[model samples]
Target chain A: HMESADLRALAKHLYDSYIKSFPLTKAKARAILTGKTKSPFVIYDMNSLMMGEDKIKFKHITKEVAIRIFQGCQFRSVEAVQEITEYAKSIPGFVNLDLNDQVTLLKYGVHEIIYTMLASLMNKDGVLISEGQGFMTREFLKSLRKPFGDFMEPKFEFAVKFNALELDDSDLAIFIAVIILSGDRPGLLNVKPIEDIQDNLLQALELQLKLNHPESSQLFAKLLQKMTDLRQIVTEHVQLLQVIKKTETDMSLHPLLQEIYK
Target chain B: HMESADLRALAKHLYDSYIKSFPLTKAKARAILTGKTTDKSPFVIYDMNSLMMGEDKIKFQSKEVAIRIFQGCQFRSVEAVQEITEYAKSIPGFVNLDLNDQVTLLKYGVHEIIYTMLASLMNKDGVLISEGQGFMTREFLKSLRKPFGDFMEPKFEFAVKFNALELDDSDLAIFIAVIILSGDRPGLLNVKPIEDIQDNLLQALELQLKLNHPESSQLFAKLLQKMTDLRQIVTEHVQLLQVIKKTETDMSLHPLLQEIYKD
Candidate 1:
């Protein structure tokens, strides 16, 4: 068992590194929640059109709108992937894995981590996109035609569920660390060692939860189950992406996502 | 939306009401986990331990053994459905549901409830059944091989992990209510009202966790995620049983279980 102080320090290191890598902050989440500061978080429609100020109409979008939304989202998705890559490299055991194993884990694990981070920008009603300047309402997204509308519902539901954990940046840092190092990801060359890495991260997470969520029993098991749910969400996400690719042939996927999807 | 105090009171009512219905309790689970409670729950092997020994012999006998065990568990499962139905009726809004909707929810939701309840009778090594009078090992089940082995290993894994949550009777009571009242069950005639009931129960569960587990912050969220896991586990269980029923030919299931596995 790791000493509580040592685990706390490790979490502190992870939190600092994670906050530097991702733009989300507890302050921003609070601001979003309280509806204060950062005036007029713009809402975006499926057509890549800005819905008026804070409100959006639930409506179908044309092919061009879908393409534009798809393209715009891809670039932002790639940017987030780059940030995730940098963050993954900062995790302690990530660099030590067999290089191919490292890539495979990242390939499989990135979307789950991204969605987990997206919880930082979300609420039950909607999610904040475009670096917290844009908002997308759940009703609006689900209202769009097939593929586009269907794709976001799972993520929004997951985000709503994940956000209920109330994890701070520090809690999230270790969580994504566990996500990246998870041994269960397929095609792992060094499974045992990857599991060893994940085990320690889980231990650190337990300690961090103990420190931060002192009133919460079974918090650790719940977080572990969320990883299972995240995996399921990713499976649905990839399925939706395939549909998007098939239907929207003209729209291009980001190279990073294309490679990962491969 | 329920006031915090009202939610607290509602949860308290649920916790008390649930304890009255179910035999399992926080103390019993703790006792089982610590190996300090009652005597060994007798292990009921397929032929009651007279199975001709030797690895190959057992392998040859595996099919028969599997059927017997399946039949045994089926009886227990049907009994559990009654308990689940009774407890579900005690839930505040269940009686108000359309009668067919109520049966559909119970039909879909029973396995998940049993498995979650099973976690209380489980430890890392195995689960106790027959009213905590019978024990089964994870190792032994996997030894059965193929469909029988593959069927239980997932539940064992889930049970082991779920047992880690340490939910006492009250937590579990509200949890089953959430499961039974869940809006998402397939074939629901009325979704919105069921969701409203579930939402209130969820809120009550959140308040209960806060009252009982003051030091724990994410308990409610974690429990919600476990419900998701439980749904997946039940899906897999039914699929495996469907395959088994098709292939085994001679294996008998209870009428209720037959009805359940019919799909």
Candidate 2:
């Protein structure tokens, strides 16, 4: 009952159609196929196709790709931190983030992921918000202080006082709202979602927006109006940020930065 | 033995008395006793009786003795015109005798000698003249040019027409006269005869006072007065020039014309 000739013919027809349909997928599949088989008539199962396509498309994903790619990329290494921090320090108006943002960015896991993602995105002009053109913001300002107990009160006092301000619950709520709004705008991520984790995060933001704030209720009304305005600003800014990040990314790969890196 | 001793004593006494009595004549005797060796020795005779003591206890002498001594030490070199000319030329101002003075000095053949002598005297602070400060008189000016072929015209023009004429010659003359008179009073020069030459030049200037022609005579007189004044100036300048020449002579020898020559 197993007709070998008919099966071989069907496999060839499907392979030819797949290659023609998706050139990149076909090329990668071809590479995997050719690499493994010595015989002219080779058998390929569904698992082979899936593995090859997934591996080839890995970099096309957003947060998940960055997380997975840089899980082991330690930013805590003195060289890594030093290079990234130095780069961050050079951007004017960059240290404007809140304490939470700074803490989140500098945490070991996030720091490694963020730095690796930024390093990759640097070539695509993704600007680190903390490393921009304003005076150091309250959150990240502490990073500029000398390490350990070598504190000079007068040197850091003015900068710290100038940037510091107490952040209430409302401010945190607004920040969260901004982050959620940022998810919908592709420009905000400056990246494409790659893994199920990135999709989940996007879906969660959408669910939170609908469930948390309903129509016409006092708190909901206020948040809704705020969200609408914030969304627009965030969308516009994210697009601008993407443009800026792309430019920065291009600049990071320029001969000048290469020389610096070397 | 006694007779010989007496004769020796007598000769000695005679010689001593001769030297004391007629010193000039005694010089000749001594000259001859020294062996008549060279023609340069003018005196070569002895007269024993000429040694006799006079009542005043000094010997008297004839003109010949006086003349012989005079002839012997008269500085025949000073009398030689060429030697005098050389001396004059050696002196700073006289060396470049204004053409007028040059011609006149040339005529006398004592230009160089007089110039050198004056220069030497001036160097010693013995003589001074006023006219020496101004340009030489026309005659002296003319003389310097003749041999040198008008080479000094520029210098003459600058000194005479340009610089000297601007100053009141009278005041300058007085100033120079004072300096020269002072040097004379100081007796800087050893020879009195040289001082006499300055006196004579001053006397020649007296002729200016008698001239009736105002323009010509006035100019001439002014120039003569300047000359007289310069006699002192020349004396001082010559003195300085001599010192300069003497110091530099070994390293930078003056030309032959500038050298002092004795005839």
Candidate 3:
């Protein structure tokens, strides 16, 4: 069991280190809580390939446009990797693990953290991206190529269900820490230590959920269930990423992102 | 808590209704228990197109061969569906659920059950397909096309790990029931009733594991963890199957299977 003082210390570290870094997430989360988000349809500003016909029914897409969209996503994805690394550093025991194990956790766990944060930028219909410069509709993502198109919709589905939990950014801060410190990443050298800290984080997380959502008795279990589902989503996303890499070899991924994927 | 009598009754119903139908599985399970199984490499009898070159280096398969291999799997999958449907009927409260709920459970749950029973036909190296007439190498399966070839390796990996628990036919009987009666299946309407029965089935399963594997204390919890992994395996499988359906439109699937994959 995690002690109250210990949990408070960890929570304070998480808030200061994680919440302070992402004002976009904080504002979007507030807007969502206040019901300021609605289903909005917006096109990408980088739809240069759409010519002047961008506003019309644009169904078929060339490889260049698809690659450009994925590149735009990768730009944000690279920044998220940096943000998650800093967030992991704030969690007390994470840095004590073997350096290689720390890298392994980051490699496998970062996308799941990104998708979890995707909820703040999302509603049931669409997600805000490019620092709220665009709100890409779920329909548009589905309309892209096979695996590229398939990636974000599942995240949106998960985000929609997650937003319904009404978890605040503070709750999300600890949640992100727990994901990065997960014991189950493939090549973990020191598992019991990792598992020990994850268990404590889980304890602290349950307390936060109970404190925050007293009326929702099942929220804790439901969130754990989501954790399991998140594994499957990451598995799917990895496979999709692999397919894209194999087929679209020329598309640029951030060097840091490429190392993680490798 | 399930009454001892109630548990015995359910166990007997499963054995008589389900286990008796699959003698090959029972014999294979016994052989596995007695160490009669081995990591042998054997070729499929239906590999006629491989000709005399079958024994030599044969790589890169045509769509015809791939379709044929999947068709063979479908043949066994169809039979397992019948066996599992009969097994579900024998469970005490299963038929009492809504007919559509029962169908949904069977549709979603059948592949998991088939993969669970697959342990009986598996060793670490490969599994016996076509009623133990052939042992397909894991390497061979991996060498085939994407999505099509991708299907069985995950099942085999799971089965290899699952077989480590050393559960017997009777233990498997209740385990299979728990899987089919799972409450969290999508499109479930009367979820609470389904959950209630599943809870009882889980109680019965835990007790069975305790009695059967007294030396392995963590077996019960380990089996539950495998169940979570099983969901991920099935999700990957459904995606692969959809990809196959899209790319290989001419391939025939069982009507029951076709219906399950329908929107």
Candidate 4:
């Protein structure tokens, strides 16, 4: 019973609502805007889905967003990714998010939430123009239409469905730290000390929260706790290694670990 | 008409008197006992007039006095002389000694005085045994005998006449500095600083004195002083240059002096 115009209007409304609600969904959105966080945006990926007779082709859209974000951030090389990854891994209390958590963050936290917030904050008229006219150029829209009709939906349905949820303040903090540390080495932040890594992460989260929601004291407290936890873990593990070396005569212990003693 | 026996007796008497007068001379005799200084007595270059001969000849007798000093010192090469000359010229106090003073020290201070003192110290018995009996077998001595014979009269006369004259300590010091600095230089001490050019004139004096007498504190003192003077002079000069540079105006000096000032 719904005509094409109605479906399009519905889609546009949905998109507008999604953009408007991004900051509420992600606690760090306001902080990022105020330069409290190192990066301007958090990222999310939406899984490809089937719509109508063919799978909805959104790969081009996703790719375009990613390309635009990357270009905007001025991240030029794979080394940047590697640096960020290494810094994240080194942070104390930073637990690697599993595949599910990653999907959650990508979908709900980064894409639907953050992007929606950005859209609402950006020029209202521009958002309306984009929504009304399908934002992208006709050529780009045509490209998306073909992909939507093609293999994107059925072939990569699982990937399309997987969405990222909002990250905790601690996690967001860690992510921002990774970006900042990456700047020093230009994609090689792995060499930083674990303590620095944790501190940076906590700082990023605090900044992001403060910028995005100045009134969120609870979020700040939560970020501080995360930082303390990271510090505690690092200290405990380091002490354990020292104790092991002190008590045991075994030289076969991890040489890499022994290097810390040196 | 003194017979050969009487001549020998008189020679022995005079030698004994000389030995008794100088403890060092008697020590040289004792040194021959232990083979310390040399196996033979020191050679005495006799004046032609002293021997009542037209031409001068060296008199080797049976004194058995051994006066070998400077046995350890050697002329490694002509290059050593060159080096010593450079060092001598560079020294402060030594730089003050004129070319003539430098030559005089090289001749009398290092070579003549040392050799004479050593000769004077020779034991009469040792000389009689070694030189008189022709027991000395040094190849250098054998080769030197001819030229020595030719030059003996002049050198002996010079030593006898000039021996008493005291050398200026500064002059002697500079002379020795030049010698030590240029001891290894090729063609003797023939190189720079202009002041050390005097060393060439005294080369013959050094050779003669070394051959004749080789142990004397007077000689050693002169040599040591020369070395000290040279070192002091060079150091003083460098310090002076530093001061000069600090005080002088850039435009007031010659280009070379200006460069030095800048430095």
lDDT of 2 by residue, A120-226 (tens): 11211111111211111222222222221111122233222211222222222222322322212222222222112223322332233334443312222122222
- C-alpha TM-scores of all predictions: 0.60, 0.16, 0.62, 0.15
What does candidate 1's lDDT look like per residue over A1-262, in tens digits? 4577877777888888888988867657659655787564445453445454225432222135545555555566667888999998888778988999999998887888878877777777777766665676777667766577677778778887777778888888998898888665668888878867666677789888978998765466557657767767876777777787787766655687567534
State residue B36's C-alpha deviation in candidate 2, in Å.
Answer: 64
Ranking by lDDT: 1, 3, 4, 2
Expressed as tens digits, the lDDT of each residue in B113-215 for candidate 3 is 8878887887766766555545566767666665677778888888877887778888888878878987767889998788677767766776677777876
TM-score, model 2 to reference: 0.16
Best by lDDT: 1
- Tens digits of per-residue lDDT for model 4 on A69-100? 22222221222333334433433333343433
Q: Which residue pairs show collisions in model 3?
A: none
How does model 1 fare in lDDT?
A: 0.73
lDDT of 3 by residue, A1-262 (tens): 4587787777667877886666577566556444677532366344533542344332222136567667667667778888888778767888998999999999999888888887888877666665554467677676777566776788888887787778887788888887787766788999878877776776677677777787764455456546666777877787888788788877755697567534
Give candidate 2's error at residue A135 in angstroms: 91
Residue B40, candidate 4: C-alpha displacement in angstroms: 99
Candidate 4 CAPRI level: incorrect
User: Residue by residue across B51-124, what tens digits does model 4's lDDT show?
Assistant: 22211333222211111111111221122233334434443334555565455334322332333332322222
- Which 10 consecutive residues of model 2 chain A have the lowest summed lDDT? A125-134
**What is candidate 2's CAPRI-style docking category based on DockQ?**
incorrect
Q: Ten consecutive residues with minimal summed lDDT in candidate 2 chain B?
A: B125-134
Give the number of the best model, judged by TM-score: 3
Better of 3 and 4 by DockQ: 3
For lDDT, candidate 1 versus 2, the one ahead is 1
